[PDB]
Design a protein around this nucleic acid. Sequence first.
RNA 1: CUUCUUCAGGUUGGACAGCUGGUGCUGCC
Lengths: 311, 138, 138, 138, 214, 214
Amino acid sequence: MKKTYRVTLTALGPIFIGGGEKLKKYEYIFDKQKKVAHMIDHTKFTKYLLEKNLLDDFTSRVNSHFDLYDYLVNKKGIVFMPLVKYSVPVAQFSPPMNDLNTFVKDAFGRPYIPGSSLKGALRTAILNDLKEDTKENEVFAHLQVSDSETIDLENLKVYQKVDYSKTAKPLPLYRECLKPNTEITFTVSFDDEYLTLKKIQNALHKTYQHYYIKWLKGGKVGETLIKGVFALDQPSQNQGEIIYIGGGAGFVSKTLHYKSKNRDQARNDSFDILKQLFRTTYSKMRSVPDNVPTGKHYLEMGKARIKLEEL
Amino acid sequence: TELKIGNEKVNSTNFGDFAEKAIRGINHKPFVNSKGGEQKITTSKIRGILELVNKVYNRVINTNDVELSENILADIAYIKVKIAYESGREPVVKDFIQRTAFTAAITDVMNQRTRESFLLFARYVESLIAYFKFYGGK
Amino acid sequence: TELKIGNEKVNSTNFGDFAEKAIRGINHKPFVNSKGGEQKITTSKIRGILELVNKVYNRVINTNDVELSENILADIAYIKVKIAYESGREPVVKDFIQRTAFTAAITDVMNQRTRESFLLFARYVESLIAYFKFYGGK
Amino acid sequence: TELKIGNEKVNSTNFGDFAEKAIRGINHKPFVNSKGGEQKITTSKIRGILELVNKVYNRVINTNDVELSENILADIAYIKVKIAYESGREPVVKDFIQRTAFTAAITDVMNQRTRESFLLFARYVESLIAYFKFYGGK
Amino acid sequence: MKLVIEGTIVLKTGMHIGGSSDFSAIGAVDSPVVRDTLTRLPLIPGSSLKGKMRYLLAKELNNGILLNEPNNDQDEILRLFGSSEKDKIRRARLKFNDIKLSNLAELETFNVSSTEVKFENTINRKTAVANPRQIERVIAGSKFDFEIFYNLDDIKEVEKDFENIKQGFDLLEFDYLGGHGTRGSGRIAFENLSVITAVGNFEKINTLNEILGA
Amino acid sequence: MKLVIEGTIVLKTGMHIGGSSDFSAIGAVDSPVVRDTLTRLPLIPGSSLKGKMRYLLAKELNNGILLNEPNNDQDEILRLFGSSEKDKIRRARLKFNDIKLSNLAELETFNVSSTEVKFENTINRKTAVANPRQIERVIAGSKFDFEIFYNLDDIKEVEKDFENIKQGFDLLEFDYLGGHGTRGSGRIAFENLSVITAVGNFEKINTLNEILGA
RNA sequence: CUUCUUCAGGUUGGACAGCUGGUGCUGCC
């Protein structure tokens, strides 16, 4: 019989998931004076333009660039407050904002992680057993995963994506993210007959072990150990409470074959499957850490915790 | 119901045929670049343009109004901004937009300011893209 | 009432037999893939085409008007655009359209503009789906 | 008269006997499905055949032309298309359509193009349903 | 009698129910929602609500084992929802109605529409190809004010019927109403549940409210 | 003397009345609505309105129960709807008419037709597979102006006749008219209920209006 | 300066299908 185990999402790391995209700074301000960033609303901007320069004249002055940090307060000399909805501070560790990614957000501004996104995440988590039941399995087709609940608006903080391969070189794409120590809640319930609490505990424990002891230690020790350590504490072995929720973290969470193989064998299968994708050879999928304001702390974008409570 | 892009555009028996002949004229004489012609503008430039037109169209369909609101007009203005920037990025998008009179259609629907002209223009652009995929590929 | 499927005029009584001929010809000699393979058009795709025809037929049929108005002709031109899009996307759909005269039939309806012409076109497409279900199976 | 069936000939006097023979052949040795059979067609599946035939019988019962009009012929062809379509949906229907040669009778009606031929065909179908009644049920 | 079960259903996550008959565009929306034809407002079909309630109530009243034909269920389900069982044909006590969107005013003040369009994915771990779709979902935060009529065939069968109706409504709470419900959509909540008599007054109608309003 | 009962029937939800004469395609409609053959305008048959009103009123007036045969209903129903019993024939004091929809111009102002298409399905509880249908349905907001003829035979019990007429009308308001009513469809409303004299004038005609409008 | 823009299944399925009553009486050779 179905039961109710309420679950929360203490997203200690910033999150990214796809719901759309936006181009260069043509409707958002990327300030650099006090290191903050801004995103515009719609209706107030429409009224503002109606009570100001005409829309065709607005259009006719785009020749790339068209930066909104040096125009709205310099070429116009007006306050930007009526045209910000989730304004956000920015701190980066230096290649300018080439492009910006958009987390999926419902019609009320607010960000959330939709359904079937958590279903793909729990597929790559709990599908460690077999690789055949992806359409007809009751572990999800009888499970009822729901959307995420409210994700805070005061916890937004822009972050820089960095490289891990023996140097911390910034990468062109930047993105506003969610600052740490933010707590999100869910209402996700499930049954017992084909998704058992002991079975799910065993599944999470075995996936956690096959990630940490099998793959993660080899990657951390393979190239550089002192790169993470400013702290890189990464609390571990705590009953498997680690979730790579979201995206922009790595290709390991996308492909699930290295949780049931050997390091050399899993990497051989990965090489075989990645020969069909892209033309660059690499031993492993390099990480994309960030910088938090200063304490140079590298944290993988999209962490969370798992806990279950009745009702 | 009536659109002006220079060739007496009509909602009936006119939008599909004229989009098809514009696509054929584009393909009949490939764009000339440095130093080889036939740039083969992919769907990536054509999409995105379609994506903006269709997000505005999505917000328009669930609105039973004879005239478009100021929000929709600002959306069309932002459409024109995006198209101008993308055309300025590389000349093949300039050729595609100029030959198909995308900007002329935008200006005409901005002058008419009615939902009928906007739906006609969206139908027209979808016709452009459908006939591009029919007579082209990728 | 006199459609122009291909090079042979289609009247109001031979739609079923000619659609049966079209389906059997496709079934007997089917499309050959680019990668040395054999496959037909799926039931989902032809059902979607019929749905497209059902979208306009459901509003045309509840009328006594001799000639279709400008809105119906606009929807028919849009359906022709979507036919072109489907043909350009999957080559099997293009083959299915070309072996029949589904594009030529829709063009004949667009040129005739009468209600009875589209009624015969709907009959012909319905018979195409019928003989796909009968011959192709499921 | 002169209603071809495929193996015999039903004239205006000989529809009920052939209908009872066909129903007995249906009642004897029921259909064989994937699971060895064995259920028989439902009253509300020969329903559909009966209203399909009546939808033209009502329009032909009250007239005096010897030959059927182009509107009646189109509807008879559409009945043929429909009976072809629905047979592909269910096998327990297809055996009914085959063992009782509906299609040959419809084709002969479409070839004779006379009022009396279709009246004889409708009488045959009506007798067929009447004889399915009093033998089966449900 | 003609008891009238009023209430309100609110969506916690965006709900999708299909049934449109309009031209889907090339990149606009691949699957819109069911809406009223005249007012263009999002609609909850009372057939969808009735069917999902019959499924959920029937399965929970069948020890979580629902396998029978609709006409082959327990007596109470049939006497609330109707059945054409050959001899004892039962008329549906519950008369569900197509529920129309109600709170357009507050949504309008919120500068939001009653529907949104979501892009999710169709990605694959294998040869990397994704098939993007466009689901239109009624905005979360939508209220649908409903009126479900009721037939009081016998006074003995009123409190049992109404407690079963309340538990059927509260079984939907830990479930969805329709559409792509297995994938995070369709969560609904019922509020302002009550009942009134259409004509005259009924004895012990407050017993119905105390088991339907709480 | 004879009286004419005017009024309007407004659809609250979609309303489907069955009856099919020709050309049901295999992907478009599976159950069309009854229509006026000449003008193609949808209509409410007087048979269906009379039958539903008689059923509801006979059930209400008798005991709340109604299992009998129409020619054995109560005396009010017998005298108002007729009786074909051999030795006891009551001539009907009501003559229902077929009711075509009147506000088609109002509907065309809103750029909609008078009929919609409703997409339903049934889900086999065994395999969870859906079987779709396609119900044509007259859109909500459609208005049907009607006329019922009342044959004023007994000058004194006309008041009770009209009270029962209003009661049956109000029973219809808390019920459905035609088609799949329990699954959302069929809801209607009555307005502008006014009785007028067919020829001449009736003494209690201002009384018969105030027992129709109230 | 990339990469798909939806794909694959169910298109209605069963239940009733015309019942009851009158049914040429009166006037003339």
